[PDB]
């Protein structure tokens, strides 16, 4: 099916991406991971998102998540994500065409023991997909948690 | 990877399923749809769930959803789902081995304009996967909304 007019401004996402990232937070020791993401569509004003991570040396599976990106022509966007760990997120924010960036903050984080808010920011940088994920808890204010850079396959 | 011991009691789900269903509710006219579901795993205590629906005559895409099933040896289970329409659900309940059934009710429905609670019940019937989805709103109590039967491919 053809790309929906609401999806067209984000068409640069469509395809499969692979790279690596790093995680850290006050309570845990820092770690590295591999990551793969696929963005796809079926002609609706929605982009399907699927993701997995693994251990670098062995390729041993770690986590996975999936969901849907819903952009609108005013530059607003909502994103819904379910994670393999048992969490859900409702993310809202904006995308910027000239910068090829997407900036999101959580309206809701569901079924979490400690996590309060999550922010997710994407940017296309020299054709590579970069992101930063920040997270808060009741006692730790919103701060860096994950960052990764992926090449388009 | 081998099937995790927490996933083994639900191994009957693993694979791809295709069939059809019917939807209805006080406010909307009744309708029919085709449906496909895949359940898969990566050796963790988690089953990945992906689903799509279409119009029967043409195969024209309608909706999609995805998420994760997390069963535990005491017979409890939690399920997280993100939908293409922009909703999320946290589902909790129980599974029964002798009946090959799973019964879930929502802890949370996120980003919904009208929906308050959702229940989802699965049963394997002569090797076919059946479900019923019930839904409530502020003014409509929990009641039938979707039902489908799918054959294992």
Q: What residue segments make up the domains of chain A, in order of their start?
A: 1-153
Nearest 5°: phi and psi at B10? -105, 20
Q: Shortest Cα distance from B64 to chain A (angstroms)? A: 9
Min Cα–Cα distance to chain B from A61, Å: 7
> Which one-letter DSSP state was computed for residue A43?
S
CB contact under 8 A, A70 and B86: yes
DSSP B37-102: EEEE--SSS-EEEEEEEE-TTT--EEEEEEEEEEE-TTSEEEEEEEETTS-EEEEEEEEETTTTEE
Method for this entry? X-ray
User: Contacts of residue A67 in chain B, CB cutoff 8 Å?
Assistant: 66, 82
Can you name the residues that pair with A70 across neighbouring β-strands?
A78
Residues in chain B: 153
Contact A110 B111 (CB under 8 A): no
B121 in Cβ contact with B103 (< 8 Å): yes
The CATH number given to B1-153 is 2.40.128.20
Contact A132, A146 (CB under 8 A): yes
CA distances from A15 to A4, A18, A39, A83, B112 (A): 16, 10, 5, 21, 29
By CB atoms closer than 10 A (0-12, 13-18, 19+), residue A84 is buried
SS3 content of chain A, % helix, strand, coil (to 5): 5, 65, 30
Q: In chain A, positions 15-44, which contact chain B (CB-CB < 8 Å)? A: 42-44
Q: Is the dihedral of CA B20, B135, B130, A41 positive or negative?
A: positive
CA distance B123 to B13: 10
The reply to whether B138 sits in an annotated binding site is: no
> Element (H or E) spanning B124, and its range?
strand B115-125
Residues 6+ apart with CB under 8 A from B28: none
Q: Which residues 6+ apart lie within 8 Å of B93 measured at CB?
A: B76, B77, B102, B103, B104, B105
Interface A:B, Cβ pairs < 8 A? 93
CA gap B126, B63 in Å, rounded: 27
């Amino acid at each position: 099916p053809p790309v929906h007019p609401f999806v067209a401004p984000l068409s640069y996402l469509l395809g499969t991406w692979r790279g690596q990232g790093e995680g850290e937070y006050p309570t845990i020791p820092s770690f590295r991971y591999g990551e793969e993401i696929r963005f796809s569509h079926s002609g609706k004003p929605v982009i399907a998102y699927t993701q997995k991570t693994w251990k670098l040396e062995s390729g041993a599976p770690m986590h996975a998540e999936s969901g849907y990106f819903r952009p609108r022509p005013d530059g607003s966007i909502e994103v819904v994500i379910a994670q393999s760990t048992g969490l859900v997120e409702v993310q809202k924010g904006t995308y910027n065409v000239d910068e090829q960036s997407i900036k999101l903050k959580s309206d809701l984080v569901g079924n979490a023991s400690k996590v309060k808010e999550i922010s997710r920011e994407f940017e296309l940088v020299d054709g590579k997909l970069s992101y930063v994920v920040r997270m808060s808890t009741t006692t730790n204010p919103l701060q860096p948690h994950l960052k990764a850079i992926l090449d388009k396959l």
